[PDB]
Design a protein around this ligand. Sequence first.
Ligand SMILES: CCCCCCCCCCCCCCCCCCC(=O)O
Length: 133
Amino acid sequence: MVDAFLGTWKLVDSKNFDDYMKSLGVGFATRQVASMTKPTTIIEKNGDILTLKTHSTFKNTEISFKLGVEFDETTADDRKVKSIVTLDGGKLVHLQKWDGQETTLVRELIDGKLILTLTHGTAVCTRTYEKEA
Ligand SMILES: CCCCCCCCCCCCCCCCCCC(=O)O
């Protein structure tokens, strides 16, 4: 059910990422480098387990999870969160919870592009990834 999300994806558009990072309390120097970074996201499955890698010249992350099962995560900005990823309306919805705060990372496919929408507080960031062969 997750299969069209699988593969290697490269960042090709970013809107409001600084707003999102600011909302999370990321410092100006980190936001500055991040605003010029173009990550590669790799999504793989092995049975029920998904692994999502995010690689860049600045920071790298990797998570593994089962859909619908909570997991601990330490984010790129060093938040220790409780996470769950589900399919909802054909979108891959990742919810992170910490200190009573929530942020969502929603992925959807539009015309073969991967659109990642990041919401925290009032900040809404939209990042577009295109598929590597
Ligand atoms: C780890 C790969 C590099 C992520 C970009 C540069 C580093 C940002 C650090 C500070 C904000 C981190 C916010 C949470 C993760 C955003 C994930 C956004 C995406 O997958 O496109």
